[PDB]
Amino acid sequence: MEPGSVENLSIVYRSRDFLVVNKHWDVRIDLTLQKQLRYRFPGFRFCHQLDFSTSGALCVALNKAAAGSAYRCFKERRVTKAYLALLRGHIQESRVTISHAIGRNSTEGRAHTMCIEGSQGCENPKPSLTDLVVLEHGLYAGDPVSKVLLKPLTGRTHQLRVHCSALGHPVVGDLTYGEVSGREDRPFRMMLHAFYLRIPTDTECVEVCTPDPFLPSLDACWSPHTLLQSLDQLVQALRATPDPD
Ligand SMILES: [Cl-]
Ligand SMILES: [Cl-]
Hints:
This protein is α+β, with helices and mostly antiparallel strands. The protein has 4 helices and 14 strands. Strands 1, 2, 3, 4, 5, 6, 10, 11, 12, 13 and 14 form an 11-stranded mixed sheet that branches. The protein has a 3-stranded antiparallel sheet with strand order 8-7-9. The relative contact order is 0.18.
């Protein structure tokens, strides 16, 4: 609930070689994540990125050998990631494969960087695949929303936000890819969280499953009413899934 501050940094994994933070929503990597890290641990190599408005799992390598190892997993597409989100509307399908290709917007890129293939001025579409599993239906601040688990198999910029918006179920509080009628200026944050991260490096399998922030005990505007799938069970399936070839 509280806004990002330099003194509050949540660590979810710490080894000799890696550190995984639970990045706060509306905090930039490059108030930044670097300053929070400097405050808590008076050289940090980010193994990957996480958007400003997104919270969650962000892996930092603490030495040159650890960075190189992690850089290899990402460049060879051997990393597993999953996210949680609160999306607009009740999604009636239990699972959705979202495969529309994502390109860069040439019409109004400044306001909405990315777009779906086929949309006006969409250029250089790239491979895209997001697996969406519906966890629950409920109301967010009295409006119908779906709590979902998202597993991207590709790394397009703003992929999850573009894909969910393209289905007609944008992320709640998404100021870029939400609809005008959605009044996305009203939620306290954008409801997208990097939940699960597995980086199978040569020396260490950095694997984290952060706490779930989209719970009625933490945000009283979220009122779940129908359970479709169990997140605990889906986390057991995530953990057992082989690393991508
Ligand atoms: Cl990245
Ligand atoms: Cl995204």
